[PDB]
Homo-oligomer: A and B are copies of this chain.
Amino acid sequence: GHGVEGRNRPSAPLDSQAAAQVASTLQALATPSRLMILTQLRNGPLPVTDLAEAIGMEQSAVSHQLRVLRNLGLVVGDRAGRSIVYSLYDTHVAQLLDEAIYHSEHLHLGLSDRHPSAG
């Protein structure tokens, strides 16, 4: 019987933790393929069959991807009879993406010149 304590006047959080925590968030959110799928949903709700038609037969990879993220959260799915809708847990992530994508899509501060094979 470990027991519980609930709230204990929590305050003054660690620093290294916030970094690590954020790292994981900014890490997962990353992933090229993951973003592509996320962006698709960002547009609006849609079934796996639709997401596949847009890409090209990948409804299976979608169901699996969402399932994984579902366990970790960040995303949620709504079961409806013989149809399951997959969407983001909340607009939070969306808002962050909107700022990053918008600010990034705005101009082109970052550049990547074709590096030589020797490099």
Q: Chain A: residues with CB nearer than 8 A to chain B? A: 13, 15-16, 18-27, 29-36, 38-39, 72-74, 89-90, 92, 95-97, 99-101, 103-105, 109-111
* Interface CB pairs A-B, < 8 A, 19: A15-B36, A18-B35, A18-B105, A19-B34, A19-B36, A19-B39, A20-B32, A22-B30, A22-B100, A23-B31, A23-B34, A25-B100, A27-B31, A30-B30, A72-B110, A74-B110, A92-B103, A95-B99, A95-B103
A interface, by DSSP: helix, strand, loop or mixed?
Answer: helix
Q: State the Cβ distance, A20 to closest chain B Cβ, in Å.
A: 4
Chain B residues whose CB sits within 8 angstroms of the CB of A19 once the complex forms: 32-36, 38-39
Contact of A99 among B21, B74, B99, B110 (CB under 8 A): B99
Which chain B residue has the least Cβ–Cβ distance from A90?
A: B109
Count of this chain's copies in the oligomeric assembly:
2
Which chain B residue has the least Cβ–Cβ distance from A98?
A: B99
Chain B residues whose CB sits within 8 angstroms of the CB of A103 once the complex forms: 92, 95-96
Contact of A30 among B23, B95, B97 (CB under 8 A): B23
Chain B residues whose CB sits within 8 angstroms of the CB of A109 once the complex forms: 73, 89-90, 92
